[PDB]
Subunit: 462 residues, 4 copies
């Protein structure tokens, strides 16, 4: 009962967090099916996992699934605003080291990751990594390279983090093999698209309580997150316009019934105020960045936006919006946590009744997790069942224990095989009460598949 | 001008067809852009293309683009009901050999393909093949192998035809290389999905004029065609249920807001009447097959359907529905072309006032093309720009002229490169008036792409 | 068998029309329930009904219901393009006088109405009137006032016709009592709104085969027809803008997720070209008029529309669009019946390849009936069950047989009582397989209604 | 300033509340337009308003508009869970008597109303009443008749309160005239419908964070609230079924694309368990009551619901659900405020891991206000502009000062005139940036209206 190896906002929130974990378990059949399937086998016995992912109720169910399969863990959040304090409390109260609270400073964010890496002031004997966005992976490679000599693999959650892993692999700087969890269909579709459909409008309502119907939105990007975000707004009755640099994604937006526009005249972002389509931006009530890119809602765009427009970002990092420009030039009036009016009158105080402001959500950080609770349990079930399978695979592979010759042929970034992707999906469908049909032998022969799958070639896009 | 090398329903429909071709050209900017870009170069000069694809207005613009780039062609439809007679007439009146009419018998269908293959009773000097579904490809391999010796390639339109090509490649029986046109994103995720969204409800309305809002539909399959078909019906207000054998596609259906059901109890299709979920099928007003598989709307399902339900197929071939069972056992009352009441009372004549019938559309053949006009020009623009690019590529490669050892290195089924897919998409977006944004050099570096694209890795699923 | 008292396009279409009538009966449970309920009673024995309403399959079922209840009728269509020739043929072949074909001239339209009014060159002994739009009503009042001395009532179908009846009543020129069928909920909602949702996109697809998704629409008006029309387009993925003069209707459009715009700068229609919002009109691909008003798509709007935009009208009369201006100034190229390219280059012939044209559907007449088949049977069931009830009521009232004192207290325009409106709706719900719940006595007492209804006060708006 | 005449949860929330009021003012152009138009005239100078309506931010803007026009007020909430504590704090900190907090007991709820009625232990000098649901109106009639002698009128917000007023009028017990604010179009067809569309899914997400897409809902009722509620869930991807006793509303549900079902076999609610459609209720994941009626989600329905279904009510009063049965028989586990697991195992404690529970939101009280923030400011703008106009009208009429014979002529429940309804709507449309078109004199004559409106007859249903 003398557990002290944690730091959370308020340990007394634990009972509430535990009640929400018990509900979440009932919403996560793929993940809880893995718990039941592998509990006796203990496939993660001896695993010591450094985890860095949004400390939500859903991540709590992931953590306790890893522990139930035999692992020890040390946990932090991968964003300063995404922790649910009741989830962090419930995990700490169960005797699991977690360093996470909603509303960390940047210094506290780094300190939290460091508290997972170090145990009693010395490097923990970690041997597995679970990451979301690549921050823990980067810190280990830059600051604790000796620890990577003992680590069998990294399982990376998100599009931005995979990009960072691939840059390291191309540069010969990745030191351990990784699984790209993002690119399972039961992750990328379910989480990146459907999760944002549920949680974007949720976060905007909680932050502002604004009517969305009848108002004008601009969604920057139309990848998986942009697709789900645009739907989140369109289904509420917003008039949604979409920006894109990828003409295939822009084609999908047109065919999906959106008008495709650019913030810049003729799409040319030459850096001048003259290039901004001021007429377009002057009619926009809400802008949402979804790109994983840098400065896609720039200073000149922010200057041109309609008065009282809402500005938010649902991509991984806040630099999608030039919030640095806003910090330098405009006065911030906090409405409530994660909601700020940015007064474009200047930086020297503000007029509480000034009409020329923007509303920035979550200080430009991931808005669904910052102003609401991120994706719902039944969606995160897919992503996190993938994470568990990937942790099992890399931990059983034992890369750190292999001779150097075996290591060279295994230093890669891989995806989960389609058969496992299908098995996760089947458990998700059953959670809805859906009934999948079984092919007859003649039908399986006719289309050239096994009755048990996989049902599509690896090239299939769904 | 003394041209007689054609067979169509009614040559006097040519002027109407030509008016619709001129409209369609204005709806097909990618295809007409290729005409403008390549007309001076004449990249298909010397090409002699056997074409087998639905003889619609959209196919007319494809044909005339190939001719405009230097090709000569001989053309037939790939389905007995999909020709638009005014399109066939306009092509024949332009001096282009075409053998196609709406409402062919099976014998006439085979004769029409044979009239493209033979000219003046002897093999035409063909050197290229454009196919949709693989029927012409199969006839050439089985009956005209000497002609394949001089053919440089096949460009195949559709999922079913690609499967047939891959079976041949794996068995060592494919004799010329092929391009899988289906799997461009501007084909598969445009034509297969959005095309069916436009044209399924269109065909049902033309065939029956039934209100769809408030009625119950069952869509068999949730691949690209099943996704577009379900949306076609849901957007009209149908209550849509979806069946699937692929749990990933079933998961998408659930997350897209559909109830996932099986015609069989617990999904087990064991051939007994007892396996049919009679309560489910007894409530269905419309069943649509979308699978490319065999007997997915089987005899026992047809016996169990609600009285007066509509039965149709939008997959390539009619054997998705057991129409043979219906021909053997039940009396067919033609309402009008491509609309039959199937009287479940028996086969010995019918009672015009019997209440126990099903309405079968297009005798189970592709319903969008059989009962309406298939996909609209602005969607087919994508598929057919891909076709032209693929014809240019295989014709310029000149496989038939290669030595045996070089043929061996090039005998493959390939897809178009992503850069070309993006260039097609860009023209389509411009056709909507969409404006694609250009990355700055810093943004392109940040995400690791060229400013000119491609913007996604080949693994990206959109 | 010597029946000659009719004029239709082609009597040989009768068997096809009869097959479609038999299907339509199965889609019209309220109307066929009235047939079964009242057949023995013959409540319309002795009725001699002049009917003027779109001679569609649905009107055929109405006609034969009146006849089955004892009436004699003489029928014409209320629009030159709305007849379905197979329906007119089936009615004529059954021995019922009908004068109607698709594609009448204005002179033929008037001649057809006159052939119902006259029998053997003399006024028919008509005693009831069923009208849609008020043309027959107007002709009787202006040209055959003596016939109105024998007529017990008029049952008027549509919003425009009711307006005309109310003007006559206010002016003391209406000569017989009328029932406003339009304002039953089972008419106005079902027909005016839902019918247009089904049939507007249907007609545009049949006329043009244009992709609608991703394109820009302007719907003029947001009453019942404008609401249904906007939904017909939005559900196809159009980007729909709405114009209105009624701020309450405009508020609904905003809340329904549409941008509300005016063709005129600041909404001020001063008659000058300068007042046109040329930037707005230059981006519109489709304009649909829904108002029942005059010149809502005027000459200056037509001049400013985007090249190749589609122009159509779904209100009752063609004068919603200034087609007279187009006839005077621009060359018309017929694509096919009810589809014309209007070449804005001038009136002296046209260039078949000119890019500066508009596509006008149905020459500006009701587009759903002109280019498709109007509303579906299951929707028209509501409107036409109301018509039958209203004919029974007015015929049984016997206004023409009353003393002058009784006539004065009965010269009114009335609606059907709510209890009958509910009974029609119940039969419609049952046709969908819907199950209405029965209030318990305690619940009925709690909300202050009878268990049998009516369930709402007459002020309720639904 | 020494003000103590209030009771709120926490006065230190005032500054947050004031920030949200200032935002809400920018979202409420009709209400703020009334403030600007009437501030100089002071039409409510001398008004002393007892107000009983949900103490939200939106109600704060209403209160301060009344005060800005000259009124003094004493305020309470009309529901124990609907107060936003920061709104109550901001109003109290402005020196306005308010007695309201989120989470009142029933005794506290009654005490709060009593603190508005009494000032310093004696009747306040009230002369106007603003009510939502009729509780304050009932207390005044039953317990404070002498106070009603000096009250000029009641302005009643909601359907349930209007029903109570009409019952009193019919029984001869209503003592002062009333305005039915509910039945303005800018109230009923804005607040009742669109408000629930925004706020129902909002409350469910905040209370449970459940994914809604792909799950089964049953909405009891399809009036204004039921229509908006069904849309709230359907737009999230729920499979929504609708129950109704009114066949017209049921017909609308069918035509809007919903399956219409009854909890009872054949719709017969005879009080036996055998009458429950157990198969139907066993598949429902969420039930929402919308009726204003009693016991529409009864004890037998609650016993039959699928395990872990969510149960909630968005009608005015909690007796739509038999929560009394649940309090008597089943154990309640509080998850967090306004979220309880109802364990169907029995009442003698509960098992935290029991799978057989229902999730009840807001203890069966109005869920949008109990678990979220009710309707958004831009929707409440309409309702509350109507409230202000109604207060001005009844206060200026001065009923309490009239002689008995004149009171008799004015004792009524009336609605606001259409012209005012349109003027409210126009301000709302301008708030979206919408542009209403002005009729030309010829067009106004053609349809029989004034250029200034009203544009529709009083019978028009929108
Ligand atoms: N908040 C969440 O819950 C959540 C969930 C999943 C992923 N993410 C993050 O969201 C981001 C996007 O992820 P994704 O999976 O959608 O990636 P994606 O690659 O599928 O899509 C990003 C899109 O942005 C477009 N884009 C890039 N630069 C642009 C610019 N300047 N203007 C317009 N469009 C531009 C690209 O063309 C691409 O289609 C990543 O940072 C990812 O880590 C967040
Ligand atoms: N009519 C058209 O215009 C049109 C357009 C494109 C393609 N097609 C044809 O439609 C068919 C489908 O093409 P696609 O691109 O959608 O292929 P696809 O592979 O994307 O989808 C077919 C789906 O059917 C499912 N399926 C197979 N057997 C099943 C069964 N017994 N029950 C339920 N689901 C089952 C598969 O799991 C798969 O997801 C092919 O024949 C293709 O050639 C028609
Ligand atoms: N084609 C069909 O099947 C069909 C069906 C029903 C009715 N109708 C006809 O459609 C028309 C409309 O009927 P409705 O029932 O919708 O009537 P409605 O009164 O409910 O709606 C007409 C709307 O037009 C608006 N309007 C008038 N002038 C306008 C202008 N200049 N600009 C913009 N908006 C303007 C009005 O404000 C009103 O809301 C009538 O002519 C009716 O007879 C046609
Ligand atoms: N929560 C909110 O923000 C909010 C907003 C407006 C009104 N309300 C309240 O919601 C309730 C409904 O208001 P409304 O304006 O929609 O009223 P309404 O009269 O328009 O609709 C109620 C509907 O319930 C139906 N109904 C009655 N008993 C039924 C039963 N046993 N089963 C099924 N259907 C049944 C009626 O037929 C009717 O159509 C009222 O109590 C009102 O005060 C709440
Ligand atoms: N609820 C959630 N938990 C963890 N990671 C997430 N990413 C998005 N939503 C999430
Ligand atoms: N199908 C139809 N028949 C008759 N009148 C109509 N009005 C609209 N559609 C109609
Ligand atoms: K969550
Ligand atoms: K077509
Ligand atoms: K029809
Ligand atoms: K609110």
């Amino acid at each position: 009962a003398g557990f002290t190896d944690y730091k959370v906002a308020d340990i007394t929130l634990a009972a509430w967090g535990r009640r929400e974990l018990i509900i979440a378990e009932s919403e996560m059949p793929a993940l809880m099916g893995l718990r039941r399937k592998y509990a006796g086998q203990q496939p993660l016995k001896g695993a010591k996992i450094l985890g860095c992912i949004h400390m939500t109720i859903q991540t709590g169910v992931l953590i306790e699934t890893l522990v139930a399969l035999g692992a020890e863990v040390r946990w932090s959040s991968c964003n300063i605003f995404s922790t649910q304090d009741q989830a962090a409390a419930a995990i700490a109260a169960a005797g699991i080291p977690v360093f996470a609270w909603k509303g960390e400073t940047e210094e506290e964010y780094e300190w939290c990751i460091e508290q997972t890496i170090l145990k009693d002031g010395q490097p923990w004997d970690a041997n597995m990594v679970l990451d979301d966005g690549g921050d823990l992976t980067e810190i280990l490679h830059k600051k604790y390279p000796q620890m990577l000599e003992r680590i069998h693999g990294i399982t990376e959650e998100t599009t931005t983090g995979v990009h960072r892993l691939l840059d390291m692999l191309k540069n010969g700087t990745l030191k351990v093999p990784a699984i790209n969890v993002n690119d399972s269909v039961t992750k990328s579709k379910n989480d990146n698209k459907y999760g944002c459909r549920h949680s974007l409008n949720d976060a905007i309502k909680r932050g502002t309580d604004h009517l969305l119907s009848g108002k004008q939105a601009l969604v920057i990007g139309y990848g998986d997150v942009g697709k789900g975000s645009s739907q989140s707004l369109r289904q509420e009755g917003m008039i949604v316009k979409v920006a894109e640099v990828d003409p295939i994604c822009a084609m999908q937006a047109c065919m999906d019934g959106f008008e495709v526009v650019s913030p810049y005249k003729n799409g040319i972002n030459d850096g001048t105020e003259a290039s901004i389509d001021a007429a377009l931006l002057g009619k926009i009530d809400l802008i949402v960045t979804t790109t994983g890119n840098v400065n896609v809602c720039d200073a000149n765009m922010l200057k041109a936006l309609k008065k009282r427009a809402v500005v938010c970002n649902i991509g991984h990092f806040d630099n999608e919006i030039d919030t640095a420009f806003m910090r330098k030039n405009w006065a911030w009036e906090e409405v409530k946590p994660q909601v700020h009016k940015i007064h474009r009158t200047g930086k020297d105080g503000f007029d509480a009744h000034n009409d020329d402001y923007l509303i920035l959500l979550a200080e430009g950080r991931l808005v669904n997790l910052g102003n609401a609770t991120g994706h719902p349990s039944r969606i995160m079930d897919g992503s996190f069942a993938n994470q568990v399978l990937a942790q099992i695979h890399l931990f059983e592979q034992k890369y750190a224990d292999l001779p150097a010759a075996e290591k060279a042929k295994r230093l890669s970034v891989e995806v989960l095989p389609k058969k496992l992707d299908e098995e996760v999906a089947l458990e998700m469908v059953k959670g809805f009460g859906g009934v999948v049909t079984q092919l007859t032998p003649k039908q399986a022969e006719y289309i050239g598949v096994s009755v048990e799958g996989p049902f599509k070639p690896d090239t299939y896009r769904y």
